Amino acid sequence: GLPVMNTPGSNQYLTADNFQSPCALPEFDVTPPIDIPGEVKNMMELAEIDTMIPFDLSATKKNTMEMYRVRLSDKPHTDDPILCLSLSPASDPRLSHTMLGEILNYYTHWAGSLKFTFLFCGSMMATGKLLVSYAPPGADPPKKRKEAMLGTHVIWDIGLQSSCTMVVPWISNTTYRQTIDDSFTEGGYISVFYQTRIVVPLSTPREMDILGFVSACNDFSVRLLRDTTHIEQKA
Amino acid sequence: GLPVMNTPGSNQYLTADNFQSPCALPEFDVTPPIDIPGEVKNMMELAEIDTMIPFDLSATKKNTMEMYRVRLSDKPHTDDPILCLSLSPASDPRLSHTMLGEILNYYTHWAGSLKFTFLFCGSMMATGKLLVSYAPPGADPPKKRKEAMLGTHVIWDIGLQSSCTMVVPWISNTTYRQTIDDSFTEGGYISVFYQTRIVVPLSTPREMDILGFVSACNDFSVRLLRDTTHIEQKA
Amino acid sequence: GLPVMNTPGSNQYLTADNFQSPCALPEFDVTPPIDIPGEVKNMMELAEIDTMIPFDLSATKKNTMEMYRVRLSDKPHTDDPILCLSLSPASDPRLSHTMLGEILNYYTHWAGSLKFTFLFCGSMMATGKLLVSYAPPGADPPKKRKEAMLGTHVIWDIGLQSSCTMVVPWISNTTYRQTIDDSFTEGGYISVFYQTRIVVPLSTPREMDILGFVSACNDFSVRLLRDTTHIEQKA
Amino acid sequence: ACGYSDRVLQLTLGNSTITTQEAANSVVAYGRWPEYLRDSEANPVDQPTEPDVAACRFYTLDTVSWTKESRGWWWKLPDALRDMGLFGQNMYYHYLGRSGYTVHVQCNASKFHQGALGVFAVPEMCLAGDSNTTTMHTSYQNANPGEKGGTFTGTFTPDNNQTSPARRFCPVDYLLGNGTLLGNAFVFPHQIINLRTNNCATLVLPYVNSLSIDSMVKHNNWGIAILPLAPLNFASESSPEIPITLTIAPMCCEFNGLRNITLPRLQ
Amino acid sequence: AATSRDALPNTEASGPTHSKEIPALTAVETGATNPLVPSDTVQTRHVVQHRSRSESSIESFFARGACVTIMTVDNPASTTNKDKLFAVWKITYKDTVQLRRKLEFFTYSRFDMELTFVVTANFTETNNGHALNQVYQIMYVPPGAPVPEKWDDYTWQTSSNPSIFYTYGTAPARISVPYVGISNAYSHFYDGFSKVPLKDQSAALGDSLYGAASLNDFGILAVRVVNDHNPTKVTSKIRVYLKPKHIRVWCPRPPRAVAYYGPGVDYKDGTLTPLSTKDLTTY
Amino acid sequence: GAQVSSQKVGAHENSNRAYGGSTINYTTINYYRDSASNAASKQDFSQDPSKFTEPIKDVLIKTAPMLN
Amino acid sequence: GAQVSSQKVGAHENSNRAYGGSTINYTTINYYRDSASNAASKQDFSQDPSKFTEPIKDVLIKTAPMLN
Amino acid sequence: GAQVSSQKVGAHENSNRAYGGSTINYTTINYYRDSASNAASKQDFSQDPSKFTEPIKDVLIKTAPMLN
Description:
The structure is cut from a larger assembly and holds 3 copies of chain A, 1 copy of chain D, 1 copy of chain E and 3 copies of chain F. By secondary structure, chain A is mainly beta. Chain A has 2 helices and 11 strands. Chain A has a single domain, classed as Sandwich (Jelly Rolls). Helices cover 4% and strands 23% of the residues of chain A. In chain A, the strands form 3 sheets. In chain A, strands 2, 3, 5, 8 and 10 form a 5-stranded antiparallel β-sheet that branches. A 3-stranded antiparallel β-sheet of chain A has the order 7-6-9, with no helix packed on it. The longest helix of chain A has 5 residues, at 99-103. By secondary structure, chain D is mostly beta strands. Chain D has helices at residues 53-56, 78-81, 86-93, 140-143; strands at residues 59-60, 64-66, 73-74, 94-98, 101-106, 114-123, 190-194, 200-205, 222-233, 242-248, 254-258. By secondary structure, chain E is mainly β. In chain E, the strands form 3 sheets. In chain E, strands 1, 2, 5, 8 and 11 form a 5-stranded antiparallel β-sheet that branches. In chain E, strands 3-10-6-7 form a 4-stranded antiparallel β-sheet, with no helix packed on it. Chain E has a 3-stranded antiparallel β-sheet with strand order 9-4-12, with no helix packed on it. Chain E starts with 57 loop residues before the first helix and ends in a 31-residue tail after the last strand. At the B-E interface, strand 2, strand 6, strand 8, strand 9 and strand 12 of B face helix 1, helix 2, strand 4, strand 5 and strand 8 of E. Chain D: It comes from Poliovirus type 1 (strain Mahoney). Chain D: This is Capsid protein VP2. Chain D: Interacts with capsid protein VP1 and capsid protein VP3 in the mature capsid.
């Protein structure tokens, strides 16, 4: 009956293949699903939830609480960066672990605008203005307020509304960027400077710390799944 | 003709598989079925027929008639259990063989309410009130009428209507319970005590026996078939 | 193209299998069939044609003409059988070769009513009454007219109409009987006795012979084909 | 309304009439009640004979004494009757015999006795023999006890005689004789006569068998097996004894293919 | 309309009571079992029961295909002094405990036997030899047909004997068989003899074993090694798996309690003790 | 002569239709002329356990007294 | 150009349709251009055994006397 | 009982239909009676990340001041 012909690619198993296969337990009455609070329909949903960036990764402060507290002081106004960061929501050790940056390793191409949210964690009295800035790639990274200022910045203010968010608009030469430290698909440069200085009244803690959070925006998306370098199975 | 492709899982025999297969005796005129009295359409039907529980399993009384007769006496009212039983209509040696408990081994998950029926088998004169009780798991098994009383009980009465039935309502944390003595999916505890005492008039047998029966209710059902431990084929 | 899966039972040849297979001589102009006198559409048709039973199988008379002539005499009325026969239109050496009994070996189950036809082959003058009888199984075979008489008999008469036929009604505990000498599916017992005696006038051959024929009735049918023991291929 | 309370009945099959007064509303095998062979499922082609009243009536077999050491009794119906009036004579005269039944197990005590007799009607009750050497070798003469019936035993005893054996069944009671637990036996059509309450059990058994109509002399159908569930006790007395007595009635029976009389070696 | 994959009657709600209605009290003499629902001995809520008996149905209980028998056969060197081994097994489930207990819960049964064959094979002797992919013949020899004498005899010509030629190493062979019973259900338990003894005969001439019905109900399987005597002797084993497909069962008999012994219900001593110990007053 | 029937899906996500709505079917085709060769259609029924549980020469009302 | 026909099922449980009602069919498709390659359709007939059983230059009534 | 659906082609040349117009479909057929055997239909949905991003006992307007 019916003359058929086995085609190049027969008897071939393909891990990510999708073909119907005989059922081991025929008839097994499956248990009805309840309505568990908190479903998730797509990974990029998780990508839109802020996760604190471990900004400091100094041999001493790494792998320990001190790693997320970016300390600011009441030092006389300077023009040097109080944090840097290579926009590589996958590559840069600073982002490589945050939910966003942790999901980004299970992929080969990320895209869309990101949103860094900074929380001033210090004495209700302390005030000041911090300039959070981004400058697309291909130019000397910014090391002075004078140079960073020229790029895309949001001159934030430490007040009642305790937090800010500088959206990093998706400005890139390709439709997606390599989720590996590739030179052609470079990310850009993020960097917060003091626009004034954190001024405090007498009898106040002179060294308050800021915590940074990061997340994707309803634009972001990833593609071509892979195995995260993050966890190894020794032997 | 027709270019096809053998898919992962070809030339694979699967015992419980259901595929059409060539007929060995082509045309063989099958003999017409008659209407034999007593058909059965589903195993759980048998599960709803009482089968006497062999309550006593003492080295002396086991594997012999005496094993189903649970003797009661005209002893002065006490507060100790005149039988126990771990609700495990599969695991507990006391139930492991009854039709219900015998069908329960051919499965990996049982569910639904059970119904224990006790028959007072003794002198028409003898009277008394026995408290049959059940207490869901996770608490010290009941060893005194005072403690068992608190759970789900049916304070039965030895009269004209010679038998009773205490339904054990399906109260459980999962949709089905392991048909193996698993701790997480524990059954509960059944236990009949004297609510008064079996009182008898003169010239009466002072030691009558009660027979217990057990069966499922139109709620019970089982799933994921296996091989009963009950019968072994040595060599 | 089209993802398929080879199922348990592939590349398996099954003698009695029925599958379409490529044609060796493509286009060969087949020769038109004529209307040959005498077609046959179903074996059981042949089963309904009488074939003479070789009733006598004595070392001397077997495998030779004398084997089909059942001789009767003008002996003074007796109550002993002038032939016997185990209803096993397959097993009993007496029937095992007749068309009916010859087709019955190519099968595992026969059924339906049979019809034994006896022809008085002797002098137009000779008269007499012979009692042809059948008695369903499970009882001492009949050895006296007195015992056989009780069963199903047709007290036949030697006259103008030279032949008779005693239908053996299909009386059996199963829907078909084993076409092998099986005890459970026993046939029954056939046996012709003299109801009077064959009386002849002077100058007549005092020893005439009767020939018996056997055939199925539009009720008979067989099933589950096999290889007849009847013909062997030595080396 | 009136005293038509379940406790009283009045069976009348044939010209006999049972009228019990502690009657536990009777059992009808499997809902299905006894009836004649519908042409739609008939098999043998002759005219089936039907004794009707001649056979259908109630036949009391012989009574069994019931003590403390009593371990149970067992009958093989098709056979159990073989003598009992015409159902006895018709029994043998035909190669085929389809017969339904109505077993009424009679046994009453005083309000002062105690015990429960589980009356189990097992279809195709194949009891096990007693030769650890060869299996099924049980002799006919011995395999069909008739009006007298056999009796369950305490513990198994292997038949050693082998120059020539005793060829009998050695039916153990906790295993319902057929190597299967008694406590689970409550699956067959049954009634427990529990001395306190009812003083009889009535089960109406419709002919059950893989065939339309089958043999009788050979193949058996239903088999009754009465076992003491609750042992009998009465007063601080050495041993008490009540007499259990069954009365069976063959209903809607028919037999095919008349012959000469069958005379089995029952001795 | 009430199929096997429905959903058990949903549990109805129920409050206090004090009625002359007496659900809880039975009386087992009637043999009838009180169909008391949880809703009777306790106050129940209104549960919308989803669970269904779709898997315990008579059809699904016997949904897996059990191993009815194993069959050893071997092709030795031509020079073998011994005759070439071709096994012959008599079709009858009663060889292994498993499928035999499942079927045994019921008194009668009507099923369509769907026989599959997982054939395997290794080189017997230490000798280091080779063997071109063997092909086996699995001839069904119907009840009463002539059972094969030598390995290579005429009986194997198979002009009318349903046979299968399995090539080693390939999708395991399968042949469906319809209810081949003489009666209207295979009787898992036959009470009575195949020959009644009659007084006007010798105790022998008319005797027989209890429980035995037809000499060859189901039939016999002849399985040879089709190739010729090859220098490297190769033994093979053909495990037959029978799975009752279109099935029906009647009269629910209590399951086998003590280890099986022979084709007949009979039981050996020792194995006579089935249950386990437990104190009449310990959970 | 297709034999299309509905499967009993447990309303699983992206299975074709569930808690977003929709049904699931499967095609079948008897291929052999001999019935005893068809795939066990698993669309089996379920009778009431009464011919075994509740078998009496009368009728039994549960709220009523057993032995009347 | 499907050749759908009815099988002769023995009203088996859950076979598709029986003593609950229903019929059973099976698809066939001749695949080769040469007829002598089609599957033996097994839907064969049955004539009356008369051209062999009852062949006479007249007519035979059974209740009548054979040799008139 | 064919399950024909539309693929999401990237308007590729000579793929059947694109920047010349046209659509692309693919046939599917559930073959096994047991649902847990069907091919993962990949036609999955997407909810709003709100039950995780924006979960508050009130409502949040973006242009508004957070901590009112």
